[PDB]
Structure formats: C-alpha cells, structure tokens
C-alpha cells in the first residue's frame, strides 16, 4: 500500500475550503463588509469571525488530543514496512502543512495587501484580516502542530527527542499570529499610512524566515525514511 489517497484529500480539502472562502469574500467584500458599523457587517463577518475562532479552537483540541492519545507506546517493535508507511503518512502531513502555509502566508496575506491599498482601514477586524489572521493562520498552525505531533508519536526517528528544525518550522510561523498585535499597534499608533513595507510589518518577516527550518526538517524526514527502507537501489 505505502502512499495512499490521503494526499488527494489533504490537497483537496484546503483547495475547496479556500476557494469557497475566496468566493465568500468576493461576494461580501463590498455590500455588507465595507462599513464596519453597519448591522449587516456584524451578521456577515463578525459572525464569521466568532464561528471560525470557535471551530478552530475545537478542531485544534480534537485533532491534537486524538493524535496524542493514539500515540504509539511500543515504538520499539515496529516493522520497517510499517515505518515506511508511517513515513509516507508524515510526508502527507508535511504536504498539507506546505499547502496551508502557502494559502495563509502568500495568498491571503498579499490579498490583505490589496485591501490595505484600496479601502480606508475601518477596524482591526476587516474581512481580509478575518479571512487571513484568524482563519488561514490558525489553520496552518493547526496543521503544523498536527504534523509535529504525528511525527513525534509515530516515527521512531522523531521520537526520543524534540527536533529543533521541526520545532522552529512549527512554532515560528505560529508566532506570526501573536505578531498581529504588532500589526494593529503599528497601524494605529505608528505609520499613519498604508505602506506594506513599513517596519511594523517586519514581525511577519522575522517569523516568516523561521519557515526556512523546513530544510532541516526535511533532511530529518529523509533520514527517517532511509532508516530501514533506505535500500537497496540507492547508493549501490
């Protein structure tokens, strides 16, 4: 079996959900979504914010708790074929994390830029941010934490210790979410402008760099892949 069709679902769920989110914001961007004090904004975007925050907290709790509860206690007696299967599953998790990171840190963040050059900022909870800071960032945070937990609880290579590159790759991008406090503070007190390259935004830049720990993470996963099922073929 080895690599199964979970990869297709991992790609498709993010693609479909984010395409629907893009449709939703293209429909309710203007027309209940420009004025932050209109009653329709509260029903179409504040309700969206509340629902998504509750659902994100619940989903994170459920997913992380399930992954930690179903953790492999007897990792010592694990066959190499099953290790290869689990390595492929962890690679699927990493693919999902990469897709979520793309959607969160590129698509909706530069989309926040479109909005932060076309309309006058009205609040800290515009549609663009709600879709990005409080939906896509928590989604990729959940995916990254789930991937880290799965690696630690199923892969013997990633067990018996916390991987430093994996921890950086998982936590640094998370630090962008609390960095939103600097974004709002730096937009209301600092910089009475919409400059996208202002120093108020280097917080995302600093913690966007920490996603480069994916290189150390990926060489660690390559070594985990090539533990028993390394060969032969390769290097022979």
């Amino acid at each position: 079996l080895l690599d199964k069709k979970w990869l297709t679902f991992a790609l498709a769920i993010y693609t479909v959900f984010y395409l629907w989110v893009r449709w939703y914001e293209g429909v309710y961007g203007w027309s209940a979504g420009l004025d932050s004090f209109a009653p329709e904004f509260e029903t179409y975007w504040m309700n969206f914010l509340y629902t998504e925050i509750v659902l994100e907290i619940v989903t994170a709790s459920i997913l992380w708790g399930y992954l930690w509860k179903t953790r492999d206690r007897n990792l010592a007696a694990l066959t190499p074929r099953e290790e290869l299967r689990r390595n492929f599953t962890h690679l699927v998790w990493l693919v999902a994390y990469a897709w979520a990171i793309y959607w969160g840190a590129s698509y909706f963040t530069e989309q926040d830029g479109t909005w932060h050059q076309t309309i006058v900022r009205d609040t800290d909870f515009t549609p663009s941010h709600i879709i990005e800071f409080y939906l896509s960032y928590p989604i990729y945070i959940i995916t990254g934490f789930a991937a880290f937990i799965y690696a630690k609880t199923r892969l013997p290579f990633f067990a018996k210790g916390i991987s430093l590159p994996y921890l950086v790759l998982v936590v640094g991008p998370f630090m962008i979410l609390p960095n939103v406090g600097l974004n709002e503070w730096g937009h209301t007190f600092w910089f009475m402008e919409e400059l996208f390259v202002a120093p108020l935004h280097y917080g995302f830049v600093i913690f966007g760099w920490l996603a480069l720990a994916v290189m150390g993470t990926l060489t660690q996963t390559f070594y985990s892949f090539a533990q028993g099922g390394l060969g032969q073929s390769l290097c022979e």
Binding site: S36, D122, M192, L234
Partner: protein, 382 residues
C-alpha cells in the same frame, strides 16, 4: 466608509468641507461626474497629525470603480502631492469617469504625509452599464493613442511567461534525474563529485550565457522601440493658490459646549456680535461632515447626502434677525441621529474633548457669512 471609526475630535478638527456639489447622481459607463467644493484647513491642527506640508487630494471609493480623470486644488491640476497651509481655504474639483457598474459611496478625501486620511462627506453615485464598455484612451507625445486598460498587457504577459519558462526549464532539466534521497546519500557517503558532471557544466554555462545575452538584447530592442522615455514624474507641488475670502463680519464666542451621554444632541452657548450693516440669522452648523440646518433660515438645495444632512437639526433659542452692531447670547442645540450614527458621541472616548465647526449666518438678501468656532466639549451625565 473608512470614517465613523476615526476619533470624533480628529474628524471635527482636521479639514472642513463645505460648498460641496456633485454634477451627477447616476452615470453610465465612460460618463463623467464632477465633484466640486471648498475645504478649510483648521487652525488648531491636532499635534499628532503632521501639518499638511505634503498632502494628496484623493478619492474615497472601493477601488477603481471610477478613474480619476482630473483633480484640481485652486484651479490647477494636482497629479502629485501638494503643500497646504494651516488656516487657508482652498477650492477643489475632482473629475471621475465611470468604470464599474454599481452603487458606490464616493468620498472626497485628503491624505496627509504624517497624519493619514481625512475623509470628507460621501455621496452614493450609481453607475450603470457594463465594465467591458469602459475605455481609457491616452495620446502620447510620440504620436500614438493607446488604451490604458490593456496597453502593454500582452508584452508584460509574454516576458513574465518567458522568464518563468526559462526557470522551469532549468529546474526540470535538473529534476529529470532522481532528486532528494539518492543525492543526499551520495553527498553524505563519501565525496559526491558524480552528481554534477559534464555536460551539466556545459548546460549551466549555456544557461548563464543565454540569460545574460537575452537580457542585453531585450534591453537593446526595448531601447530601439520606444526610443523616447521619461522617468516617473514625482515631487510635491508647492504654491497652491488659496481662496481670498473676505473677512467675516460676524464674531462668535463659544461659552461652553456640552453633549449628553448618552444622547444624540450637542448644545452650546454662543455670543454672536453682528458687525457690518445687515441683519443676520444663524442658518447652519457644520461640525464633521454633518450639517445641522435651521429650516426657517436656510434650506439645502445642492443634493447633500441625506444621512449627513439635518434639515431641522439646528435649534436656536433666539434666532430672530440680529441687527448690525447688536450682540446677543443664544443657546444653540445641534440634534440629529447622525450625531450617533457617525459616532460624534464617541468623542467621550477621545483623549482630547474639543470640537470645531463652521457656522453659517444668512442675511435677508441671502448672502452668507462663514464663521469658524472651536471650544472644549464637556460631556454631561447627570
């Protein structure tokens, strides 16, 4: 649409827009709508807002639903940022061409280099038609007429696609062979020195030489075609001509100003001294895009937005004609639902509870005097 969120005192004391007019309320695609009026820079400019040494006359709209054909501050075109003087009154004019169908709330705004956006009154303008009909023809000094909607689009697409294809070709050439784990193991276990051998080096030399040559030849070709180019034109424009308004013949002293918390009314006591030689009557109080009118004195006929206009929102305790030379003290109440809808009552949250506004006095002949008032605004709870 970005106001009702800015501090009420900041909206009250930045820039006062008056004599606003809109040429049309409903336009077709490619039709022109002209926005005129005057804006006055408040003398008590808030200290956290930089003085309008560098200001830009902008339009508040949801993206390019209109294109700004022209904009004038003092009769002359202002495509760049301008310098405004605190205390001066300027007349402006913005010309917009309809581009996208729909109902758009068009604001006249001013952006300041160190204080952000100062949004004026917004008016709903309806655009009808189709976006496909929109044209933006421009004639260049080289003698060619181009449409700015699609000019250079094909060239941009071609060049970006070409360079993307070059990069993809490089990556794919290296990706035909196994990529990650065998190469990692070969580099780890002993010297690698086998994964990069000719003609890989020849291919890299070819890629480098071709890239440099293509860049050079493309630059030369883009020099031959379009032989006449200019840099981006930029720079703050000084010498904005202000209006030479006559000195007002009405002097108003504000003796305390209060607003109930909660409430939709603002009350102030004014000592009005009528100089000149005509009996005057207070007809309007404008504070922040909100016009409180006394219907018995003045009626609005310029199509001001209904949500910002209070036809009978101004009540004067004694609004009988004020004879010249006579000075009297009256109680003026400015009450309208706009005071709460546009959050002018949120000044209680502001760290500077002071207000500014415009008073308009009309005589029998109808000619009006613009007198400017500002005072601390004291909330009342008991």
């Amino acid at each position: 649409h970005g106001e009702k969120s800015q501090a009420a005192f900041m909206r009250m004391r930045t820039i006062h827009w008056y004599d606003l007019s809109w040429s049309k309320e409903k336009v077709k695609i490619n039709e022109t709508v002209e926005i005129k009026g005057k804006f006055h820079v408040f003398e008590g400019w808030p200290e956290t807002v930089d003085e309008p040494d560098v200001a830009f006359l902008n339009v508040g709209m949801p993206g390019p639903v209109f294109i700004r054909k022209e904009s004038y501050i003092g009769g002359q075109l202002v495509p760049r940022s301008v310098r405004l003087e605190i205390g001066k009154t300027y007349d402006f004019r913005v010309v917009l061409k309809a581009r996208r169908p729909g109902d758009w709330h068009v604001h006249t705004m001013m952006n300041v280099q160190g204080g952000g956006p100062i949004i004026g009154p917004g008016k709903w303008i309806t655009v009808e038609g189709s976006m496909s009909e929109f044209r933006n023809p421009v004639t260049t000094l080289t003698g060619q007429t181009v449409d700015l909607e699609n000019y250079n689009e094909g060239n941009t697409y071609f060049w970006h696609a070409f360079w993307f294809a070059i990069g993809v070709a490089w990556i794919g050439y290296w990706s035909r062979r196994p990529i990650f784990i065998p190469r990692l193991l070969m580099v780890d276990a002993g010297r690698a020195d086998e994964l990069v051998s000719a003609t890989d080096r020849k291919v890299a030399m070819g890629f480098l030489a071709a890239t440099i040559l293509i860049v050079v030849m493309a630059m030369s070709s883009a020099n031959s075609k379009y032989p006449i180019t200019i840099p981006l034109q930029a720079g703050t424009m000084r010498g904005m001509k202000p209006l030479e308004l006559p000195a007002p013949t009405v002097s108003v002293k504000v003796e305390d100003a209060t607003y109930r918390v909660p409430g939709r009314a603002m009350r102030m006591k004014l000592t009005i001294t009528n100089h000149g030689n005509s009996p005057i009557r207070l007809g309007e109080f404008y504070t922040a895009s909100v016009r409180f009118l006394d219907s018995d004195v003045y009626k609005d006929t310029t199509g001001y937005p209904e949500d910002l206009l209070a036809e009978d929102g101004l009540s004067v305790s004694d609004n009988s004609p004020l004879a010249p030379g006579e000075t009297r003290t009256v109680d003026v109440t400015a009450s309208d639902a706009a005071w709460e809808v546009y959050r002018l009552s949120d000044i209680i949250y502001d760290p500077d509870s002071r207000f500014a506004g415009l008073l308009f006095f009309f005589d029998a002949t109808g000619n009006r005097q613009v007198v400017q008032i500002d005072a601390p605004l004291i909330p009342s709870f008991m």
